[PDB]
Amino acid sequence: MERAEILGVGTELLYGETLDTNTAEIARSLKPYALKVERTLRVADEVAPLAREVEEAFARARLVVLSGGLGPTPDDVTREAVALALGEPLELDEAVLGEIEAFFRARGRAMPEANRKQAMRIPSATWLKNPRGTAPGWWVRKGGKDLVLLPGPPPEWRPMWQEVLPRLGLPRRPYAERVLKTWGIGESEIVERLGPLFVREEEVEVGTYPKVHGVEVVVRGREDRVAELAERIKKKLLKEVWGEGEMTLAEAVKRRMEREGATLSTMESLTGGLLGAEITRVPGASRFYLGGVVSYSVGAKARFGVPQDLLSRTVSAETARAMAEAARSLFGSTYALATTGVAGPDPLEGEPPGTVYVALAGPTGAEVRRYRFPGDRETVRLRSVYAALALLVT
Amino acid sequence: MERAEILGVGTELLYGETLDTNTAEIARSLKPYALKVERTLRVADEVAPLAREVEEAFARARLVVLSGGLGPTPDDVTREAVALALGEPLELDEAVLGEIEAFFRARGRAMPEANRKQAMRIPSATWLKNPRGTAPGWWVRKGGKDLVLLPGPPPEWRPMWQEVLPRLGLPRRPYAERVLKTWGIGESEIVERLGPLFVREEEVEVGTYPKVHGVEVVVRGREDRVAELAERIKKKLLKEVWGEGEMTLAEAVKRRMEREGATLSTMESLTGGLLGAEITRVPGASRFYLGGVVSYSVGAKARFGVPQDLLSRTVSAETARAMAEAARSLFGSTYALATTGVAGPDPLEGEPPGTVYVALAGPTGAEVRRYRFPGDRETVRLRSVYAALALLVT
């Protein structure tokens, strides 16, 4: 399989002063083709380093795509870099120069001298029309290789890329991917359960990505291999998979409450309202979520029904159970969730940061899960939210 | 100036399944140092291409920083690729292994076999301790050059990076950035109001950056020029500036409550818990924040003290005042904040998304502000949270 190289040009991209979504978006558009994307680059607006990166990318790849630096400014140098990298001179296209003059005439302005350089192309390039912006793009076919220069602004380049891409004659490969969202199983145990199913090959691969909402498992590559492989993986992870694709825990909870015609409330200590925030992130939450309380002080815990004998051990399974039962009673909801624990940075009741209990109470009784989350304060808080949501969808 | 190279390791980063903020963040951290950043890379989880990219970056750089791929799975291959790129064997460190085992034992687990590879290093590497994870990093000093391997999760690498960075003996340059945070004033009015102070030179520059917590005025460049210009700006915007640097509205509130010896409580509808989440984000919040109610249904509103007469008209200044008064009497706090209004996507009571009332109730009475916020549901929720906090600190 041959390579695709993707370079986003712009000094500000290095520093995240513009968030580089271009290179990712181009990479995802190449999924249907038999090309390997091994890396993406973001490159400073300097002609010599950029020419070097372009020359190296072009040498190793069937396709090179560059985005950005097609402006009129001294910091727009991609055309110069590309010409330098490919050993071709820049040539003024008078007709395209006329088009750029027209762009400014149409807005009531003369063309600035600076923009004149946007009418430059190398002999190996055909123009890609840009009816939304000043700078036409290039399509270079050289050596059985393709190099495409696109403008930085998405509303400019997306239609240009969409039209040129099926013209490049790229090898096609029937592609699929399957994303499995788990909870309550760490990467190590997933490794062990999958064994040889944890395939890393050219035709198909398996990846795990640990998130605050649990470990995601992604199978991607050839459509035949993916469907089979991912189905075996799902069967092996069956109890821990709570959703696939775009599903989120908050959406999964909503689906269960709608399926049952049930309602929900919450009582939170350490998460501070973040659980209610996460449940109500999803439009239509008011159909099942009656509301909640944030029992942050001891006085509030007692006010909302935590038994007095548990106030010395609010970090405990017993208190979690009591809080969920109290919320269920206080709101008259079908179910209720509770969070209690040690966020960090300090211990609480002799328990170390990351000690968390979550509880769910319902018409058949309550249940509690204990966690010892590694992470700083903000992290432990977030895992706690998802742990509590996970009690509803296992 | 010598080069710093920065590689984010992760197949998911290429496709933007996780947006790579790590490389940009590390690049920003290096601005006080006289190292050039010509490019940044994201690299797939594949050992041969990764080893090639690492070998090349190390050859050309004074400093190489890798982020990610230190997990226990077959797609975590950074250690092996670095070992290949530097020509050194990986060797199990029995001591680190003992620490990982202890880490799992504390959590009530035996250490899984797949974790063993996290205690592997090359002879040139010293360990960088990761108290928040099972993967410690590496610092390799070899031939006058540094290569640092960090965990992917920002809560994990950030403290590790902060501590090793001064120890690298990198050449310094006098750079600084000052961030002035304002509320209640648009970019246009700021630009216009500073005027000659809105400098954009090679030495120093002033930028405006709209955020959900108000428009930031960032001054950056040569330390001396930054510091002087920043003082002159904060004077021109003295009415508008509520904080600088790492100050947040939630920390400002905490400083005010502690200074008064006062307490706070909340009652929230559209924000769904997010306001109590943001207050409690800051360590020490239990010294003043008593707790809150998420009144997300008519039944919850009534039960916690909102008058029957208002329950049908939730998008109103009267409802926001009554909520803040109901929270303050329920929790007995010195102050109480409330949010009500239209998050989106749907209109409510004839009012569009973005129509929000925030209220504060205090010793001397209640105050309400109406906003009309731009943005999608999550954005309106966020801006509402800050607008409620702003009542206390602007």
Ligand SMILES: Nc1ncnc2c1ncn2[C@@H]1O[C@H](COP(=O)(O)O)[C@@H](O)[C@H]1O
């Ligand atoms: N790599 C990139 N990813 C996403 N957006 C980009 C990129 N490069 C430029 N832009 C967008 O193009 C516009 C500014 O480009 P410029 O002003 O030419 O640097 C803004 O809308 C940017 O967000």
Ligand SMILES: [Mg+2]
């Ligand atoms: Mg640019």
Ligand SMILES: [Mg+2]
């Ligand atoms: Mg990874």
